[PDB]
Amino acid sequence: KTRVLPSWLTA
């Protein structure tokens, strides 16, 4: 199960 992290976490 993949998730999408909010951009601030991956920037």
Next chain:
Amino acid sequence: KSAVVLCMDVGLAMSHSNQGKESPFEQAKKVMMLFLQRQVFAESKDEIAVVLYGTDTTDNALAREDQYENISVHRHLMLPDFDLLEQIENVVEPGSVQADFLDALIVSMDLLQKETLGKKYTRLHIAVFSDLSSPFSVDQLEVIIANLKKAEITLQFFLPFSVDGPGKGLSDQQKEGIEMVRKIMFSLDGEEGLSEVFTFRDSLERLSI
């Protein structure tokens, strides 16, 4: 002041009552209430948010079809009050579903990141209460850990049993959750972390440090 998220599993499993007179759900609610009462009576300046996971409805900033489902922000980051006490006692109810605790952790981290903007805190704190009965995905957990370190967030897990006598009939899924908790806490605090799993019976005092 400090900023605290109480991240509370209210999923269906938490309502199963086979330890004493109070189910894990009712025990965790009681701890939350005592903690919040201490904070209100002491006029502490700490801000305290409440995130529930395992709720029948979904209400959070990351929710969108099939994402961060069954997680609800019950209280945003603000001073505690008697309305919050009234809601927790009367409003907050057990859910009929289950949710992913790492999704709930991410929601809690996103709440803290946004709601602490432009303010100064001595500590950022997330306290998770759960029986670890339900599945979770580890996708991108390495990013979560990196940010928990970067933001210097203290993470505490509270479970309604000890993980250090007879065995307690823990499911394989609970054992997997416990091991994951251990891996997260070791990633953050090292060898010390392998033992940083706490029980409901000790949670009120561990919170109030």
